[PDB]
């Protein structure tokens, strides 16, 4: 099944949400 993997953890090095908001502005 779909579990917590290293791609997820490696992704936790970046805060994409905050900067996607910078884009929506």
């Amino acid at each position: 099944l779909q579990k917590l993997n290293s791609w997820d953890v490696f992704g936790n090095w970046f805060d994409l949400a905050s900067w996607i908001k910078y884009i929506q502005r």
Partner: antibody
Amino acid sequence: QVQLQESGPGLLKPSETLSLTCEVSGASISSSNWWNWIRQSPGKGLEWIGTIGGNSGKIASSPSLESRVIMSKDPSKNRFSLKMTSVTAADTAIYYCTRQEQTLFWVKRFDVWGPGILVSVTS
Amino acid sequence: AIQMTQSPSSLSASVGDRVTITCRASQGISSYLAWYQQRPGKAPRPLIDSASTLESGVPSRFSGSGSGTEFTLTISSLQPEDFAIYYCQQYYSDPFTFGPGTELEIYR
């Protein structure tokens, strides 16, 4: 020196919903950390329930409680929270908030714990 | 999930004895194994991580070893304050699981 402090009410009614919040006092919620909640009952034992990533916001729970557990994080107030529903009294336990540092590709131990919060479900 | 077991669930010794808890896992979880000490009342305290690397503030007498299925926590000389409950926990994969716990008490 990261310091975790649980909050929320320890007075609950059966088949309902509790809400706990962990104030972080050493690092930003929106960091390369993983904010976890841990459950400890004498018979049910020391059980991991949930986690959320400070940056990615990716959420993960225990197969048993994923169906009735919810994770959240408020960086503006530098806290993270969890809320479990259908609160059978068997869930009555101590709830700690912990965190995991991480390497490039995986998590680490629970290096820091909160004092623990006693939430009981009964009238 | 990953079945985490621990032996013995109970054990009694006295100051000066080399005591040893053992921790077993369903699968080969490499070195992703940590040990916590919980003196009843307060919250768990991490002692070992990566199976054989002890946290800050951990007395040197404590030791860990293992790299796969079965690991060992090893106190090289018991002390008045070591009479706590010891949990082993894997973080190799989720759901993250703990061992049953291992009791450690005094005499008389």
